[PDB]
């Protein structure tokens, strides 16, 4: 019942299965991110957000029987996606070649931004971020190079890099800090995430599922 999304010739499948935790996610929504200089928006990377199947049953708890327009203006609904008792997978596939650090910089930027936004950015979180950046250093992402973030409900972030848009088998690293976990996703679909790219998508495709209250295969 669920379909795919190509964002600037970078395709995001309808479903996916982690070689790491054998879970199976569904494309919640795709989108793209980039920079705005001189009123021009140059897109650098595509972005798709995946939710584990067990997410429908969970969100159905309070979001079923509501429509796109309705959820889209509801913040809680997102705090629920980002902090849901389930794994979320976020895949960023480059549109413009960026190095590990060049990129890991903008990302780490909005993160700490939020961490302080809610008084969670302390020593531990700080080390976790150091680590976060130590992971991206050896890397580089020419177009098609994907980064895979696994946000585990157990308060862990699974970092894994690729030269193309196919998920790797093993992971680059694991950042074990509950805060830093949600961070990424929060910076993309959170309250303070200006772009309605991911938000509109999620708001549009989930009710279709939420009406059945289940998911698997
Ligand atoms: O998916 C991206 C792209 C990234 C980025 C854009 C332009 C650039 O030059 C380097 C990195 O910024 C981000 C910041 C975030 O908090 C979350 C996701 C992203």
From Swiss-Prot:
GO terms for molecular function: chalcone isomerase activity. It catalyses: a chalcone = a flavanone. Changing residue 187 to A: Reduced reaction rate. Pathway: Secondary metabolite biosynthesis; flavonoid biosynthesis. The keyword Iron does not apply. Substrate binds at residues 45, 110, 187. Pfam families: Chalcone (PF02431). Optimum pH is 7-8.5 with 4,2',4'-trihydroxychalcone as substrate, at 25 degrees Celsius. The record marks 103 as: Important for catalytic activity. The keyword Nucleotidyltransferase does not apply. GO terms for biological process: flavonoid biosynthetic process. InterPro entries: CFI (IPR044164), Chalcone_isomerase (IPR016087), Chalcone_isomerase_3-sand (IPR016088), Chalcone_isomerase_bundle_sf (IPR016089), Chalcone_isomerase_sf (IPR036298). Keywords: Flavonoid biosynthesis, Isomerase. Gene3D superfamilies: 1.10.890.20, 3.50.70.10. Its EC number is 5.5.1.6. Part of the biosynthetic pathway for all classes of flavonoids, a large class of secondary plant metabolites, many of which are brightly colored. Catalyzes the intramolecular cyclization of bicyclic chalcones into tricyclic (S)-flavanones. Responsible for the isomerization of 4,2',4',6'-tetrahydroxychalcone (also termed chalcone) into naringenin. Belongs to the chalcone isomerase family. This is Chalcone--flavanone isomerase 1. It comes from Medicago sativa (Alfalfa). The gene is CHI1.
């Amino acid at each position: 019942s669920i379909t795919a999304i190509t964002v600037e010739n970078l395709e995001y499948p309808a479903v996916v299965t982690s070689p790491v935790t054998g879970k199976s996610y569904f494309l919640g929504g795709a989108g793209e991110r980039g920079l705005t200089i001189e009123g021009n928006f140059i897109k650098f990377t595509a972005i798709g957000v995946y939710l584990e199947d067990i997410a429908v049953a969970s969100l159905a708890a309070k979001w079923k029987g509501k429509s796109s327009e309705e959820l889209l203006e509801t913040l809680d609904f997102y705090r629920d996606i980002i902090s849901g008792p389930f794994e979320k997978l976020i895949r960023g596939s480059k549109i413009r070649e960026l190095s590990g650090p060049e990129f890991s910089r903008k990302v780490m930027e909005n993160c700490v931004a939020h961490l302080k936004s809610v008084g969670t950015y302390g020593d531990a979180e700080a080390e976790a971020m150091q680590k976060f950046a130590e992971a991206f250093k050896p890397v580089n992402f020419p177009p098609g190079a994907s980064v895979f973030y696994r946000q585990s409900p157990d308060g862990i972030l699974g970092l894994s890099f690729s030269p193309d848009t196919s998920i790797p088998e093993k992971e680059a690293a694991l950042i074990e800090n509950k805060a830093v976990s949600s961070a990424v996703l929060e910076t993309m679909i959170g309250e303070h995430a200006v772009s309605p790219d991911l938000k509109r998508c999620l708001a549009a495709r989930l009710p279709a599922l939420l009406n059945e209250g289940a998911f698997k295969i």
